[PDB]
Amino acid sequence: LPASFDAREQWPQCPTIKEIRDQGSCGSCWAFGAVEAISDRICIHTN
Amino acid sequence: VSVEVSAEDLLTCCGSMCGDGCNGGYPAEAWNFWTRKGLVSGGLYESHVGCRPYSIPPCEHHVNGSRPPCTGEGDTPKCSKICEPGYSPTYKQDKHYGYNSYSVSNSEKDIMAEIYKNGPVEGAFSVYSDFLLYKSGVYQHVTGEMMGGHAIRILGWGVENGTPYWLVANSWNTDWGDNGFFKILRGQDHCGIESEVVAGIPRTD
Numbered sequence: 470l471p472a473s474f475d476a477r478e479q480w481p482q483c484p485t486i487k488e489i490r491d492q493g494s495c496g497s498c499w500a501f502g503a504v505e506a507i508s509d510r511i512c513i514h515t516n
Numbered sequence: 517v518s519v520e521v522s523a524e525d526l527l528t529c530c531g532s533m534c535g536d537g538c539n540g541g542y543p544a545e546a547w548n549f550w551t552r553k554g555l556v557s558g559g560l561y562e563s564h565v566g567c568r569p570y571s572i573p574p575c576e577h578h579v580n581g582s583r584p585p586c587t588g589e590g591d592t593p594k595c596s597k598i599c600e601p602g603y604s605p606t607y608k609q610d611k612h613y614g615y616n617s618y619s620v621s622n623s624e625k626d627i628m629a630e631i632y633k634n635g636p637v638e639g640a641f642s643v644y645s646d647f648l649l650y651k652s653g654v655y656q657h658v659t660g661e662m663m664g665g666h667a668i669r670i671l672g673w674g675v676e677n678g679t680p681y682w683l684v685a686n687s688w689n690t691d692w693g694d695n696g697f698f699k700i701l702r703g704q705d706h707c708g709i710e711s712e713v714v715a716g717i718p719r720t721d
Contacts, residue, residue, distance in 0.1 A: 470628050473674030475683060476636050484518055486636065486671060489696035490560060492687040493572035494587035497527050499534070499541035501687040502638035502667040504521040506715065507550060509671075511612060512518045513635035514718045 476509065483512035521612065522558025524568040526550070529595035537592025538572075543638050543667045547617035547716045554611030556599065567599035567610040577688035578648045617716030624703045627713055628673055639684075640667040640712040641700065650693050654679035655700040657707055670713070673702055682709060 477487045485508040492501050527537065530549045535541030549555070559565030561573050571593050575586040599607050620630045620637060630637055645660030654676050672683035681699040690696040700709055 470625075470632050473672070474628070474632060475672040475674070476631065477671065480635065483635075485520060488520070489685055489690045490523065490570070490687050491574040491689045492523075493561070493570075493575055494590050495527075495538035495572045495592070496540050496589045497523060497538055497572070498667045498687055499543045499546055499640075500523045500527045500530075502640070502669050503543050503546040503550070504523045504526055504555060505669045505685060505687075506636045506638050507547075507555065507612075507614070507718075508519060508521045509636045509669075510634065510715075511521065511718050514720065515517060516720060 480509075480513055483509060485509055485512065519557050519612065520559050520566055521550075521555045522566055522568040522570070524558050524570045524593070525556050527570075528593050529553070529597070531595075538589045539592075543640060543712070544617070544619065544714045547614065547638070547714050550612075551614035551617050551716060551719075554613040556607055556610040556612070564600065564602065567603050567607055568596070569600065574689055577692050579692050581691050583689075613719045615717045615719040618714065620713040620715060622705060622711045622713075624673075624710055627670070627710060630713075630715055631670065631672065634715065634717065636669050636671040636685075637713050637715040638667060639670050639709055639714075640665045641707040641709040642666075644707070650698050652694050653677065653699065654681045655698055665708075665712075667712075670709075674699075684709075 557566030558568035
């Protein structure tokens with residue numbers, strides 16, 4: 470595999486990969502990791 | 517074509533299957549919710565983007581900044597199965613579902629392969645006091661006390677100042693860390709980063 474990889478590069482047609490969200494004052498990080506990766510993969514896998 | 521999938525919707529509507537709302541959850545249960553119920557769109561706070569935008573406002577996490585300081589946790593808002601006024605179509609018909617969901621082995625080669633093949637994953641690591649001071653570079657834990665797990669997004673890898681890293685997105689806004697992203701040591705299961713990684717594949721039509 471390459472020695473470095475950055476999804477933001479490979480798929481610069483998928484804006485969400487570069488987006489950083491805010492969990493505020495709530496331990497929601499479990500949801501955040503999940504929906505952010507899920508948003509990415511919807512565009513990566515998009516026919 | 518692209519969608520911001522709603523954290524609001526998964527936070528508030530998964531229920532006990534995902535754990536306890538704003539007092540913690542189970543990311544593997546979060547990917548199985550999406551596969552079973554789906555997840556609607558929704559943007560960032562006050563964005564008015566999508567079905568269900570996020571309703572908890574931003575704050576400064578451990579940085580100085582203009583926003584209010586962050587409070588402990590708060591109240592998990594509630595599951596409203598309806599979209600905001602102004603958004604169309606209906607909540608049910610804004611659902612997106614997953615085909616499937618899985619664990620990725622605690623192997624940086626396996627984890628480089630998943631991302632490489634399929635795009636970013638979710639992992640989780642133990643946070644220690646020294647983390648919170650993360651401004652730049654490759655993160656390696658020397659001091660501090662343990663503060664629990666932090667579930668993140670891992671979106672690549674590389675080598676910096678001779679250190680092999682993982683490229684991770686945090687959810688503490690853009691003004692913490694490296695513009696809200698960070699690098700943590702790769703290949704040693706550092707702080708558990710390689711042990712708790714889950715992903716899944718979208719369902720297509």
